[PDB]
C-alpha cells in the first residue's frame with residue numbers, strides 16, 4: 224500500500240463529527256477558509272500542475288492539528304481496523320472536522336499527482352464533478368450557513384501510456400477520496416436534519432445544497448474508481464506463479480465513514496420532504512444525484528454486480 228499512495232492517510236473518527244451548523248462553523252470554518260483561499264490563490268487554477276503546487280503549498284501552510292493515532296478504540300471492531308488497514312488509513316486524534324480539512328487536501332494532492340503525470344481517461348464532465356467535490360466540501364465548511372459556489376477545475380490531459388500498477392494507485396487514492404466525501408456528506412446531512420428539526424429553513428437549505436454537491440462529487444469519485452477497477456481487472460488476466468494478491472476492497476458493513484453517512488441519510492427523509500413543501504428545488508436534484516451515485520456503485524463495490 225505504501226508503494227501506491229502516501230500513507231498513513233490520517234482521518235478522524237466519523238462518530239465524532241459535529242451535528243449542527245453552529246457547531247460545525249465553530250469547529251472548522253477558520254481552517255476551511257484558509258484551505259479555500261490557498262486553493263484559489265493567484266495562479267492556482269491555470270492548469271493542473273499549478274493546482275497541485277497550490278494544494279501542497281496550502282497543506283504546508285496550515286497549523287498542524289493531529290495528535291497521533293487513536294490507537295486503542297473500544298468502539299472499533301477488528302473488522303473496522305482491517306477495513307482501514309487495507310487502504311493505509313490511520314484514525315487520528317484531534318479535532319475531527321479540522322482533520323477532515325487536512326485529509327481533503329491530502330486526498331486531492333494524491334489524485335492530482337497521478338493526473339499531472341499520466342492524465343486521465345475520464346470524461347471532462349466527470350472530471351469536473353469529481354475534482355469539484357473538493358471545492359464543494361471546503362467551500363461549504365468555510366461557511367456552512369451558505370450554499371457553496373462552484374469553481375473552475377483545470378482539465379486533465381489525455382491518459383498516457385500505462386505504468387505498472389497505476390490502476391491500483393488510482394484505486395487506492397480514489398478510496399481516500401471516498402472517505403473524505405463520506406464524512407463531508409454525513410456532516411451536511413446531519414446539519415440538514417438538525418436545522419429542519421429546529422425550523423431553520425435557511426440552514427436546512429444550505430445543508431441540502433452541500434449534501435447534493437457532495438453527492439455529485441461522490442458520483443464522480445465512483446466513476447474515477449470504476450475506471451481504475453476496470454483497468455485493474457485487465458492487469459489481473461495474467462496468471463502468476465506467486466499467490467495472486469487481490470486489490471484491497473472496502474467491506475461495507477465494516478467501513479465506519481460509510482456506516483455513519485448511511486445512518487444520517489436514513490434519518491433525513493422527512494427533512495427532504497419538508498424542504499420540498501417549503502419551495503426548495505434541492506430535494507429533486509438531490510434525489511437525482513442520489514440515484515446516480517447508487518447506480519455508480521456497480522463496478523466499484525464488491526457487494527454490487
Ligand code: HEC
Pocket residue numbers: 400401402404405408438441444445472473474475478481484485488489513516517520523524525526
Ligand atoms: C462497497 C464497499 C461500497 C463502496 C465503495 C461505497 N459504498 Fe455506498 N453502499 C454500499 C452498500 C453495500 C450499500 C447498500 C446497503 C444495503 O444494501 O442495505 C450502499 C448504499 C449507498 C447509498 C444509499 C443509501 C440509502 O439509500 O439510504 C449511498 C447514498 C451511498 N452508498 C454512498 C456512497 C458513497 C457516497 C460512496 C463513495 C464516496 C460509496 N457509497 C461507496 C457499499 C459501498
